C-alpha cells in the first residue's frame, strides 16, 4: 500500500531524510508520488507540510514508526 | 487530443476504409517543414464513404489486428459552395 | 530428524494438493456443460415442443450454474470467466428455441 516514510540522503555518517509518500514496494530511495516532510537528527531540524500529510492519511496512507511519532509531535493525529 | 483529418485511398474492403493522412513536420536538423504521409485502417460500419472522400478520423477501442480508428464525417472544412462577390 | 526447508518443500506440497482440488472443480464444469450441450443437440435436431422438453434441460442447466458458481467462490475460477460460461449456456438455450420457434425479439 501507500506508505509515508523516510528516504535516506546526505552522506557518510551524516544523514538527512526526506519524508515521502510512496508505494511500499518501491526501494528505500526509489521513485515516489509526492515529497512532503523533511527531517534530521543531528541539526534537530524537523518540519512538515501538513495539508499533504492529511491528504494522504485521508486516502489511507500508513506511516512507519519513526514517521508516525514525528507526526505525533507536530499534532497531525489530533486534527485527524 | 486533436483528431486526424485525411482522405480515402481504398474503400474496397467491408466495414473498413484505408485512409491517408498527410501532416507537416519541421525536420529536426534542417528546419524546413516536410510532408509525411501515413496510412490507416479505419473502421466504418454502414460503408458510407467512397474513394476520394475527405474524412475525419477518430480514436476508439481496437476492432482488429489493425483498425483502432472510427471513420467520422468531415469535421469542418471551407465550403466549396459559391459565395457573394462584394 | 530435523528438516529445514520451509518455503520450498511446504509450498510444493501445498501446490500439489490445491492443484488436485482445482482440477476437480474445473472438470466438473466441463462435464455438466457437456451434458447440457448433448441435450441441446438432441433437441435442436428432432421435433419436440419445448414446453415439455425444457424440464430435463433446465434441470441440467441449473446443475451447471451450481457447478460454475461453486467453483467461483471456492476460488478455482475468476468470476468474470463464470459470467462467460453461463452466458454461453444461455446463448445455446436461446439458439435452439428460435429454430423450433418460440421467441424472436426484433426491433
Amino acid at each position: 500500500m501507500v506508505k509515508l516514510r523516510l528516504k535516506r540522503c546526505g552522506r557518510k555518517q551524516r544523514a538527512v531524510y526526506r519524508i515521502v509518500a510512496i508505494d511500499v514496494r518501491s526501494r528505500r530511495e526509489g521513485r515516489d508520488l509526492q515529497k512532503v516532510g523533511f527531517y534530521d537528527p543531528i541539526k534537530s531540524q524537523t518540519y512538515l507540510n501538513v495539508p499533504a500529510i492529511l491528504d494522504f492519511l485521508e486516502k489511507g496512507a500508513q506511516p512507519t514508526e519513526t514517521v508516525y511519532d514525528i507526526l505525533k509531535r507536530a499534532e497531525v493525529f489530533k486534527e485527524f | 487530443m486533436r483528431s486526424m483529418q485525411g482522405k480515402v485511398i481504398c474503400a474496397t474492403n467491408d466495414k473498413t476504409v484505408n485512409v491517408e493522412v498527410v501532416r507537416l513536420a519541421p525536420h529536426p536538423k534542417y528546419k524546413r517543414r516536410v510532408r509525411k504521409k501515413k496510412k490507416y485502417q479505419a473502421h466504418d460500419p454502414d460503408n458510407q464513404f467512397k474513394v476520394g472522400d475527405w474524412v475525419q478520423l477518430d480514436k476508439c477501442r481496437p476492432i482488429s489486428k489493425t483498425k483502432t480508428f472510427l471513420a467520422v464525417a468531415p469535421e469542418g472544412r471551407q465550403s466549396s459552395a459559391t459565395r457573394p462577390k462584394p | 530428524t530435523l528438516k529445514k526447508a520451509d518455503s520450498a518443500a511446504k509450498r510444493t506440497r501445498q501446490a500439489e494438493t490445491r492443484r488436485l482440488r482445482n482440477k476437480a472443480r474445473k472438470s466438473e464444469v466441463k462435464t455438466r456443460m457437456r451434458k447440457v450441450f448433448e441435450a441441446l443437440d438432441a433437441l435442436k435436431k428432432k421435433s419436440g415442443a419445448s414446453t415439455e422438453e425444457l424440464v430435463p434441460i433446465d434441470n441440467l442447466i441449473a446443475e451447471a450454474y451450481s457447478a460454475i458458481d461453486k467453483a467461483v467462490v471456492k476460488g478455482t475460477l475468476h468470476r468474470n470467466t463464470a459470467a462467460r460460461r453461463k452466458s454461453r449456456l444461455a446463448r445455446n438455450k436461446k439458439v435452439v428455441e428460435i429454430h423450433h420457434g418460440w421467441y424472436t425479439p426484433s426491433l
Partner: protein, 122 residues
C-alpha cells in the same frame, strides 16, 4: 547545398580511424616475441634499428620498436607493448614498454628515467 537534398541525408561524417588496430582499444597489450632482428631505416636516415616481431593476445602479429640503448630481449620472451609511431621505419606502429615483464630497464640512464623504466639512484 540544396536544402531539399540535405534532407536526403547528404551529410555523413567520416569516422575516426585508429592508428593502432592491433591494440583493439587498449593502452597496452602483452605479447610474445616471435623474432628479434634489425632493420635499416628509410633514407637518408641510415642507422641500425632494434625491432622485434610480436604475436599478441588479440592474435595479431606486428613489428614493434625497442627504445633506449641495448636490450636483453630474445625469442619466447613476454613483453608489453604500447602505441606510438616511428616515422623512420615503414610499418612499425608500436613500441615496447621498458622495465616491465621481460624487458628490463635501460642500464645507466640518468635522465627522463620514467620513459625507460629505471630506478632512481640513491
Amino acid at each position: 547545398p540544396t536544402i531539399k537534398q540535405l534532407i536526403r541525408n547528404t551529410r555523413q561524417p567520416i569516422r575516426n580511424v585508429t592508428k593502432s588496430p592491433a591494440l583493439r582499444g587498449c593502452p597496452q597489450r602483452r605479447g610474445t616475441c616471435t623474432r628479434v632482428y634489425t632493420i635499416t631505416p628509410k633514407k637518408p636516415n641510415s642507422a641500425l634499428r632494434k625491432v622485434a616481431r610480436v604475436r599478441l593476445t588479440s592474435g595479431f602479429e606486428i613489428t614493434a620498436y625497442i627504445p633506449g640503448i641495448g636490450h636483453n630481449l630474445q625469442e619466447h620472451s613476454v613483453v608489453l607493448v604500447r602505441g606510438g609511431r616511428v616515422k623512420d621505419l615503414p610499418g612499425v606502429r608500436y613500441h615496447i614498454v621498458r622495465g616491465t615483464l621481460d624487458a628490463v630497464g635501460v642500464k645507466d640512464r640518468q635522465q627522463g628515467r620514467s620513459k625507460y623504466g629505471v630506478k632512481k639512484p640513491k
